[PDB]
Amino acid sequence: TSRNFSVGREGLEYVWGNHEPVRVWAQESAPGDPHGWPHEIIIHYYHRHPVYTVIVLCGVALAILVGTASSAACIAKARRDCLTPYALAPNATVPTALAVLCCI
Amino acid sequence: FEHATTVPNVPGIPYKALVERAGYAPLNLEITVVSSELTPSTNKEYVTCKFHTVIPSPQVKCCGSLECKASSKADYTCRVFGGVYPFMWGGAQCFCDSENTQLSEAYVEFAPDCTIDHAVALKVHTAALKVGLRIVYGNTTAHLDTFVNGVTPGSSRDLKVIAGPISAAFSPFDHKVVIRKGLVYNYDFPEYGAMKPGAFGDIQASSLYATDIVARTDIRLLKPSVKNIHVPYTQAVSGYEMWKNNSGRPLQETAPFGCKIEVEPLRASNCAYGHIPISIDIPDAAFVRSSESPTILEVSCTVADCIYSADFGGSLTLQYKADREGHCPVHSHSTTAVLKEATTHVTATGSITLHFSTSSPQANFIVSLCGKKTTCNAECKPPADHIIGEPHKVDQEFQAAVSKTSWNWLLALFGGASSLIVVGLIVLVCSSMLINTRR
């Protein structure tokens, strides 16, 4: 027969019949390269610590998303608070010098 | 001198420390836990084994009445039956017809083979850790055994090492333990005096040759039916035999932390758990002045190739220039990298190749050659073998465990997120005073 046993960093001891106990430890020989491109980095760290890698990748995606939304909102309200007051006020004229400096 | 080190309690991996005092050359220290003992305080509740049902020779009164008496033997059951007329080989044994009375007795003894086949019920209190050390300072090696309690000065000759309290209190034994033929079981045995028929401990005694045996084996004495003389009885099974059939696996195979459970005395040897705060008092003869010790002028560390594995999967050559011959100790001032060799022979101008083990995916540690520490840079590839037969010499951190390329990617993305926030804020304020100046 064949039996499958999970070995961690701490080790595993198996005794087969009247044999001396034999101990085996597990190394981080995860598929991928931690020093290569980002996707091999991701494969390595996912195969090593999956939940930690998922948490970190979700955190970085959240960090980019809130911050892209924040920059977009800041540029948006700045654009509107520069455009609505007098740039496009009724019967109001804004020449090139203070129009093209940011507009279009 | 006093050195406060935290030696991980794993039996076989030396912990390399560097004790340095002002005006003296650094001294290499090596604390190895050759052995460990977890001895708990025990209390023998009782002794149990298979019981032998002693049925004495029946007593019959031919024309008269018999009375049950009180006896102190284990599970002494007595009953008196009304009309018997018993027969032996030779005919009837009484002259009356139905006024004959029988007295059935049945108690419980210890089986003759119980001197070898018996179980000891024990209660174990707090445990004591007693470790053996191989402290190496300079070129003198001291072997000593010390109690890990925080106050005991366990010293071999003059070392004066004090092992502080263990960080975590761990015991493979719970409150109640059963020892049978060298095997150790964690069983909730019945207390002394409360024995249940058909279960472990149905017969109890303070010793094998004690006279105060107590038992409860459910001996029911039945009415004789055949004409021949007979004490008919029915009884529960041996709780010892039932427990032997349903014993499970011993603590010798179910113990955590890879402990070796041993008896006489009961102990758990070579357990790998926690940290031992060892404080050492090195004799002044070991230390040497800096004047007559070799002095390094320029040391540069280059690491050829490395992997992060349990063994010494790393190479580290360093080119130094020193003024004199001698032996200068080396040390890695990093928790993620350790060095196989500690003392190196210095030959004026030259190089020495030092093997190291690391668990971070990088050699980014500081190596001191009797002073003048230098930094090392490398990339440590993942190992080839998946399973190794040797413990990991270094514990796994987080900042170490994340590589510099991954750190750069994460830092770049998070810093871009922060730069978006700050550029949004500066644009917001720019527009704010723009509006303020507009009106």
Side-chain angles (χ1 to χ4, degrees), chain A residues 14-84:
Chain A
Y14 70 95
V15 190
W16 169 238
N18 299 134
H19 273 287
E20 290 316 303
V22 27
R23 324 184 131 192
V24 279
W25 291 259
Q27 286 171 357
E28 299 77 354
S29 56
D33 197 37
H35 300 263
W37 265 219
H39 71 277
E40 303 91 321
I41 292 188
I42 286 316
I43 301 180
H44 197 58
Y45 282 139
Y46 183 80
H47 273 219
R48 281 179 63 188
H49 309 298
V51 73
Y52 274 80
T53 289
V54 166
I55 271 161
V56 163
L57 270 202
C58 155
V60 74
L62 176 273
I64 196 48
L65 174 288
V66 56
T68 47
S70 210
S71 159
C74 294
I75 284 46
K77 74 201 136 276
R79 194 60 151 193
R80 61 194 74 258
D81 67 43
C82 177
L83 194 289
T84 65

Side-chain angles (χ1 to χ4, degrees), chain B residues 36-328:
Chain B
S36 92
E37 270 196 0
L38 209 42
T39 326
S41 179
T42 65
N43 206 223
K44 196 221 238 186
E45 287 276 317
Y46 53 80
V47 156
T48 189
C49 73
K50 209 193 153 147
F51 56 78
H52 174 234
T53 318
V54 181
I55 293 161
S57 302
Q59 178 175 201
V60 309
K61 183 106 184 53
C62 290
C63 312
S65 151
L66 277 186
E67 255 316 352
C68 295
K69 304 283 180 33
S71 147
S72 38
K73 324 232 187 79
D75 219 23
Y76 177 77
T77 309
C78 192
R79 259 191 82 178
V80 157
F81 299 109
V84 279
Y85 206 55
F87 272 88
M88 277 216 252
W89 176 263
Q93 300 300 316
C94 291
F95 33 103
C96 270
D97 304 301
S98 81
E99 281 112 321
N100 327 294
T101 317
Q102 198 195 267
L103 189 138
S104 292
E105 288 185 33
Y107 51 91
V108 149
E109 253 178 7
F110 265 143
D113 303 316
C114 278
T115 41
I116 292 298
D117 212 329
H118 68 109
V120 172
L122 299 150
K123 285 165 146 186
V124 279
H125 325 304
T126 54
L129 199 55
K130 170 204 207 78
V131 289
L133 304 174
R134 185 151 61 51
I135 309 158
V136 195
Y137 57 101
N139 43 295
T140 76
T141 323
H143 278 77
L144 51 98
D145 285 16
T146 174
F147 276 83
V148 179
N149 50 36
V151 317
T152 285
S155 172
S156 45
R157 142 192 310 98
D158 53 328
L159 242 181
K160 304 321 320 183
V161 21
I162 287 137
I166 191 85
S167 68
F170 160 75
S171 203
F173 316 109
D174 45 278
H175 200 206
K176 287 158 156 198
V177 183
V178 171
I179 308 202
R180 182 216 180 227
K181 305 220 276 184
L183 301 164
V184 169
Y185 306 83
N186 273 348
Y187 190 90
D188 201 339
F189 53 74
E191 293 280 342
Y192 185 73
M195 35 265 170
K196 274 166 39 62
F200 178 86
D202 48 12
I203 174 175
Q204 303 163 357
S206 92
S207 190
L208 285 164
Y209 317 116
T211 36
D212 74 13
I213 297 169
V214 283
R216 248 208 285 280
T217 63
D218 208 304
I219 301 167
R220 314 209 136 102
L221 282 174
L222 312 181
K223 200 213 191 331
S225 45
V226 310
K227 45 184 29 181
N228 321 92
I229 183 76
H230 200 46
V231 169
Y233 77 115
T234 178
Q235 207 186 15
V237 289
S238 211
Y240 191 73
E241 301 274 22
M242 280 264 298
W243 172 80
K244 265 165 55 189
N245 209 51
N246 323 315
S247 37
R249 307 304 315 166
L251 265 187
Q252 269 94 330
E253 308 168 1
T254 74
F257 288 109
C259 293
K260 205 180 149 17
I261 309 299
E262 288 164 354
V263 289
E264 281 325 317
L266 175 77
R267 46 193 203 279
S269 49
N270 288 3
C271 297
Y273 73 102
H275 301 251
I276 302 169
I278 286 195
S279 276
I280 317 90
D281 183 339
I282 315 100
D284 80 41
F287 294 85
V288 81
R289 316 281 271 150
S290 296
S291 268
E292 72 283 341
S293 166
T295 300
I296 313 302
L297 265 285
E298 157 31 70
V299 49
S300 46
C301 154
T302 56
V303 19
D305 203 358
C306 67
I307 58 175
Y308 44 97
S309 39
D311 60 90
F312 286 110
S315 204
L316 187 132
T317 190
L318 47 57
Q319 278 197 23
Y320 79 110
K321 260 166 43 53
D323 50 18
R324 94 180 51 187
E325 295 332 321
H327 332 111
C328 262

